[PDB]
Amino acid sequence: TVPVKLKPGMDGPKVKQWPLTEEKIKALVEICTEMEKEGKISKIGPENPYNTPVFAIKKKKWRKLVDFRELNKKTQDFWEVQLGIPHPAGLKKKKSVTVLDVGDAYFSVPLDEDFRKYTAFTIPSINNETPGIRYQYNVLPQGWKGSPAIFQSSMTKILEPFRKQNPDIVIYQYMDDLYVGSDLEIGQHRTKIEELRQHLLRWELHPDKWTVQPIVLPEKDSWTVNDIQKLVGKLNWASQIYPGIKVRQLCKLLRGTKALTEVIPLTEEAELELAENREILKEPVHGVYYDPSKDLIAEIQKQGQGQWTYQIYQEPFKNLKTGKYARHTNDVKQLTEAVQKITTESIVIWGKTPKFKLPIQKETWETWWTEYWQATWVPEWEFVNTPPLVKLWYQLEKEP
Amino acid sequence: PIETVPVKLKPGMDGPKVKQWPLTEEKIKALVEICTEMEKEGKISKIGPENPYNTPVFKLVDFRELNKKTQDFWEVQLGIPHPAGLKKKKSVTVLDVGDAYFSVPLDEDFRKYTAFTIPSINNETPGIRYQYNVLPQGWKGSPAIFQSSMTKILEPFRKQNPDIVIYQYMDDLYVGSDLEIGQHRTKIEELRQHLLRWGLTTPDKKHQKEPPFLWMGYELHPDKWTVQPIVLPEKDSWTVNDIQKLVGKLNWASQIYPGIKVRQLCKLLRGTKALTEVIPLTEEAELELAENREILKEPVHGVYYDPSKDLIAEIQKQGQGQWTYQIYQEPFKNLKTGKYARMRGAHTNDVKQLTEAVQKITTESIVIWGKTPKFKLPIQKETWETWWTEYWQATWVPEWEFVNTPPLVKLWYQLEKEPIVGAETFYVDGAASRETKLGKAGYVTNKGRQKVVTLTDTTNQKTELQAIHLALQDSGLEVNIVTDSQYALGIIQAQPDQSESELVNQIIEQLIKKEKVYLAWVPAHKGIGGNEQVDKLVSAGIR
RNA sequence: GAGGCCACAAUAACUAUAGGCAUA
DNA sequence: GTATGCCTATAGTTATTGTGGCC
Ligand SMILES: O=C1Nc2ccc(Cl)cc2[C@@](C#CC2CC2)(C(F)(F)F)O1
Ligand SMILES: [Ca+2]
Numbered sequence: 001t002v003p004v005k006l007k008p009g010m011d012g013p014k015v016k017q018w019p020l021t022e023e024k025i026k027a028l029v030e031i032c033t034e035m036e037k038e039g040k041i042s043k044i045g046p047e048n049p050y051n052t053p054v055f056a057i058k059k060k061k062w063r064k065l066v067d068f069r070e071l072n073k074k075t076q077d078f079w080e081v082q083l084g085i086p087h088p089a090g091l092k093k094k095k096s097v098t099v100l101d102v103g104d105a106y107f108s109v110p111l112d113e114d115f116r117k118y119t120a121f122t123i124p125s126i127n128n129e130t131p132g133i134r135y136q137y138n139v140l141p142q143g144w145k146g147s148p149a150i151f152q153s154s155m156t157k158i159l160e161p162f163r164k165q166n167p168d169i170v171i172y173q174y175m176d177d178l179y180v181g182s183d184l185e186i187g188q189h190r191t192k193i194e195e196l197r198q199h200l201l202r203w204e205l206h207p208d209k210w211t212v213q214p215i216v217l218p219e220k221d222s223w224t225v226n227d228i229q230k231l232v233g234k235l236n237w238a239s240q241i242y243p244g245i246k247v248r249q250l251c252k253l254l255r256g257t258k259a260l261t262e263v264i265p266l267t268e269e270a271e272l273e274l275a276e277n278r279e280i281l282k283e284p285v286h287g288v289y290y291d292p293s294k295d296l297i298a299e300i301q302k303q304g305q306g307q308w309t310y311q312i313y314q315e316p317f318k319n320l321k322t323g324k325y326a327r328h329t330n331d332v333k334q335l336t337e338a339v340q341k342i343t344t345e346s347i348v349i350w351g352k353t354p355k356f357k358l359p360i361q362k363e364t365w366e367t368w369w370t371e372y373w374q375a376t377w378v379p380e381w382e383f384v385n386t387p388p389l390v391k392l393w394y395q396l397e398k399e400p
Numbered sequence: 401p402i403e404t405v406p407v408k409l410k411p412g413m414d415g416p417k418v419k420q421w422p423l424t425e426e427k428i429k430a431l432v433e434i435c436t437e438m439e440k441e442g443k444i445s446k447i448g449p450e451n452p453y454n455t456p457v458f459k460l461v462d463f464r465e466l467n468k469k470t471q472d473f474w475e476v477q478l479g480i481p482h483p484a485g486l487k488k489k490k491s492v493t494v495l496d497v498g499d500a501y502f503s504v505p506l507d508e509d510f511r512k513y514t515a516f517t518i519p520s521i522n523n524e525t526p527g528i529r530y531q532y533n534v535l536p537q538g539w540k541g542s543p544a545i546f547q548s549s550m551t552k553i554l555e556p557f558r559k560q561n562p563d564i565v566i567y568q569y570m571d572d573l574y575v576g577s578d579l580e581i582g583q584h585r586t587k588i589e590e591l592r593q594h595l596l597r598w599g600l601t602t603p604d605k606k607h608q609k610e611p612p613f614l615w616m617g618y619e620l621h622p623d624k625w626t627v628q629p630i631v632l633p634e635k636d637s638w639t640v641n642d643i644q645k646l647v648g649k650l651n652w653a654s655q656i657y658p659g660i661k662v663r664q665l666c667k668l669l670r671g672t673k674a675l676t677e678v679i680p681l682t683e684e685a686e687l688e689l690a691e692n693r694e695i696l697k698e699p700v701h702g703v704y705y706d707p708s709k710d711l712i713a714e715i716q717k718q719g720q721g722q723w724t725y726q727i728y729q730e731p732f733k734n735l736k737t738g739k740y741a742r743m744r745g746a747h748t749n750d751v752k753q754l755t756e757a758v759q760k761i762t763t764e765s766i767v768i769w770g771k772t773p774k775f776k777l778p779i780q781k782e783t784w785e786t787w788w789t790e791y792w793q794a795t796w797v798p799e800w801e802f803v804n805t806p807p808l809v810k811l812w813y814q815l816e817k818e819p820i821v822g823a824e825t826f827y828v829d830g831a832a833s834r835e836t837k838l839g840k841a842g843y844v845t846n847k848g849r850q851k852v853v854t855l856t857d858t859t860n861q862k863t864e865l866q867a868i869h870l871a872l873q874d875s876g877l878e879v880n881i882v883t884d885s886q887y888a889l890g891i892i893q894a895q896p897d898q899s900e901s902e903l904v905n906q907i908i909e910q911l912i913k914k915e916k917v918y919l920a921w922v923p924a925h926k927g928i929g930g931n932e933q934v935d936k937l938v939s940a941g942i943r
Numbered sequence: 944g945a946g947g948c949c950a951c952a953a954u955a956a957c958u959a960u961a962g963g964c965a966u967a
Numbered sequence: 968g969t970a971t972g973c974c975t976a977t978a979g980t981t982a983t984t985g986t987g988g989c990c
Contacts, residue, residue: 019767020766021771022770023770025770045405045548046544046545046547046548047405047406047408047471049472049474051474126485127482127485127486127770128479128480128767131547131548134474226818226819226920229920229922229928232926236923236926237923251927256930256933257825257827257844257846258825260819260825260918261819261821261822301792302793302794304790316961331794331795331796332795335794359792359794361977363759363763364759364794364795367762367763382977382978383977384961384976384977385961385962386793386961387963388792388886421944456944457944459990462947464947475948475949480987537990538947538990542990570989570990615988616950616987616988616989617986617988627987628987630986640984641984641985644954645985646985647953648952648984648985649985649986649987650986651951651953652951652985652986653986655951669953669954669984670954671954672955743953746976832965834965834966834973859973860973864964885963885964886963886964887964887974890963890975891975924964
């Protein structure tokens with residue numbers, strides 16, 4: 001086995017377990033029993049003081065998720081600087097990419113003995129009527145970032161035969177997932193995937209349809225005092241993202257204490273300012289470029305009526321990417337879907353996961369995010385109050 | 401034979417080397433007498449100069465330094481069960497192991513750290529040195545290691561006896577069954593004989609306690625649970641320490657006694673105060689303290705959990721950001737009760753705090769019963785869909801239904817979405833100085849009217865609300881207001897029914913009386929008409 | 944050798960992120 | 968121009984007091 005360590009000053013994960021419903025506790029005892037028979041995990045004593053949360057997911061029966069967000073952090077030099085998997089820039093340019101689970105490809109590989117204690121997790125019991133069942137991994141765990149890093153070697157050697165017979169196709173691996181980059185058509189794509197599923201059994205997204213979209217301002221016959229006041233507040237705010245935006249000639253029109261309903265004729269100087277503000281928005285933004293050394297950030301706003309706006313950026317107001325998502329459904333189900341859609345988008349494009357700013361209370365999210373989660377990764381997230389001008393501004397994007 | 405759990409000190413640390421102070425002669429005779437017994441039974445061993453370590457005698461000996469040097473463990477009392485969670489049983493007994501630690505061996509390599517000395521009377525002469533062979537009292541690792549031993553000692557018995565429920569809790573076993581008492585008593589004795597194979601003693605039938613069992617401050621019957629009776633003293637002078645323990649007893653009551661409120665007494669404890677400061681009760685505390693004192697005359701009890709039925713949670717508003725709930729399965733037979741009080745003071749409207757209360761109860765239901773309840777809330781299903789579709793944050797509740805028990809939960813006013821044709825347009829502003837804490841509020845109207853008052857001892861935030869207070873006060877039933885204060889505009893869209901500031905629910909009364917109000921925001925300092933004029937008036941003497 | 948340990952609550956104090964206002 | 972100064976959020980954290988316990 002490959003020796004793994006931590007940073008020399010780091011301690012092991014000591015994360016508390018969020019409480020679980022009885023339906024999921026029963027499902028987890030089943031799953032971990034069979035994993036104990038098959039040698040994959042082992043019960044441990046109380047002399048092991050580390051813990052890592054464990055959850056249950058449906059993902060198209062049940063499934064065990066281990067939230068290793070804290071352990072990955074404490075081994076990040078190991079799986080990033082040392083054995084890291086480099087990113088294919090050509091992946092996002094494929095006309096179509098589909099996603100493959102290769103989770104079961106880790107269970108064969110043994111795990112370094114001195115490192116298994118850091119991987120401890122605790123099935124809890126209802127009402128604390130029972131001590132809590134404590135396993136630890138004996139093999140490479142699904143969801144630890146060291147796992148594909150270590151399986152890296154044996155993954156090149158298991159695909160070179162396919163990749164030699166298709167050196168056009170690009171395929172990239174983040175965690176327990178494979179990404180198949182192709183330009184072939186829908187028929188000659190799905191045939192290729194079910195071939196590769198048989199090449200591996202031996203041992204539905206299109207990034208081009210994603211497009212940053214332009215802001216569109218109202219188009220009005222009769223502008224009113226109120227209409228303009230609303231519009232300069234929005235434009236004044238968006239001059240932080242488009243600095244070539246001005247409101248000088250629109251405020252000249254609001255001279256003296258006018259009633260809110262009064263109609264204002266657009267002077268030619270105003271009508272010009274407006275017409276180029278429009279042109280600055282209908283074209284891209286500039287000076288914004290991806291930085292490999294900084295964290296991606298993703299912020300979602302609730303728009304109402306089952307639709308949502310997001311932005312991926314690295315410094316305030318410099319959005320690498322923005323978009324919209326819309327809908328027997330509730331906010332949490334929708335929010336959970338956006339977070340997964342935004343993440344896989346962010347995965348193919350940059351090979352990284354964004355840290356989310358979520359417009360929900362932490363307690364509520366901790367309760368229900370597990371209901372509709374289907375991914376093997378879980379991203380970093382935090383809980384924010386969306387300011388009103390941010391909601392108002394990104395409403396005005398256009399729809400595909 | 402119970403195998404030892406391997407234990408290590410924390411990386412870099414060495415074992416304790418604390419000095420033994422000399423002790424009274426009457427103290428020494430008592431130590432040598434019980435130390436020679438523990439030696440006779442193999443619990444401790446005499447040692448010699450080969451051992452560099454030592455801990456001082458006290459719980460026989462005090463292991464402060466050693467516990468600081470011992471590795472961490474995954475601690476076993478993560479949380480206490482709650483009585484509501486337990487299922488009704490027919491026959492329950494409690495066994496207490498009495499040679500608990502004495503019967504678990506200590507990892508061989510760790511024993512050298514437990515060394516301790518009985519000093520000599522003359523003290524010129526050296527003393528007797530000993531070390532532990534079994535889990536010592538007061539050692540950080542004893543509880544978790546004992547619990548791990550007990551858990552595997554009971555696993556054969558548990559598999560052989562599926563219907564019996566053994567709950568381990570420190571040195572105690574709590575055993576329940578639906579067997580009838582005779583056949584219960586037979587199983588209890590097989591369990592005693594099992595524990596006895598590994599040398600664990602337990603009270604025989606003649607010595608076992610009868611229901612009810614006192615546990616963790618609860619009184620546990622086989623069919624119901626209660627708390628031990630709650631005394632709160634009657635004084636005329638009240639020190640801050642006294643109000644601390646008042647709030648403590650009430651908070652402990654609120655799990656079974658419904659409708660307890662403490663937020664009035666907690667408000668007395670805000671800010672620093674030496675514990676003997678004789679604080680006089682605000683009188684609306686005595687109101688709440690009266691209501692609470694009589695609620696505790698009532699008899700109460702909780703029932704146990706029937707898994708085959710649904711859980712129901714019903715919430716009532718007690719007012720002033722105070723709420724109370726009950727959980728039951730069959731009507732008027734409560735499992736437990738609780739309270740929820742926002743006390744951030746943050747401006748939050750009742751619809752939101754309500755949603756917060758349900759989120760606390762959902763979390764607690766999953767801890768205690770492993771499933772979420774069905775809710776009965778004093779809020780209309782359209783009033784809720786009104787708020788939570790206009791609100792910026794997401795939420796989600798499980799099944800809930802309206803229930804009509806006043807006071808209900810309504811949105812006190814409704815601001816217009818578009819500007820009101822034919823309504824006077826007010827342009828408001830405030831301004832204050834930090835240095836002189838002095839400021840002005842005012843407005844300017846499209847119909848020619850204007851007004852400026854000077855306030856004293858304010859902040860910029862306060863003056864911007866005062867100016868809105870003036871426009872609403874000097875205007876008709878339909879107004880358009882424009883402010884430049886994102887603060888004032890925000891604190892009014894969210895509609896805080898309660899508050900600590902008089903000025904803000906003052907304003908909320910004004911908005912209640914009004915028929916149509918439209919509230920708009922423009923950015924400050926941009927030459928926008930109306931705002932410019934009023935900003936000139938308000939900031940004249942101020943900046 | 945001036946009790947530690949757990950759950951909950953209250954009070955106080957300080958870290959980050961975002962937002963606001965103000966002033967130089 | 969670029970920095971500090973004061974408030975509000977969403978979170979995290981260390982300390983005290985208290986209720987109920989235990990050793
Ligand atoms: O599930 C049940 N039902 C129940 C009813 C009454 C009593 Cl008094 C005790 C129980 C029991 C327990 C317990 C711990 C809180 C001590 C028992 F383990 F069976 F003792 O657990
Ligand atoms: Ca102002």
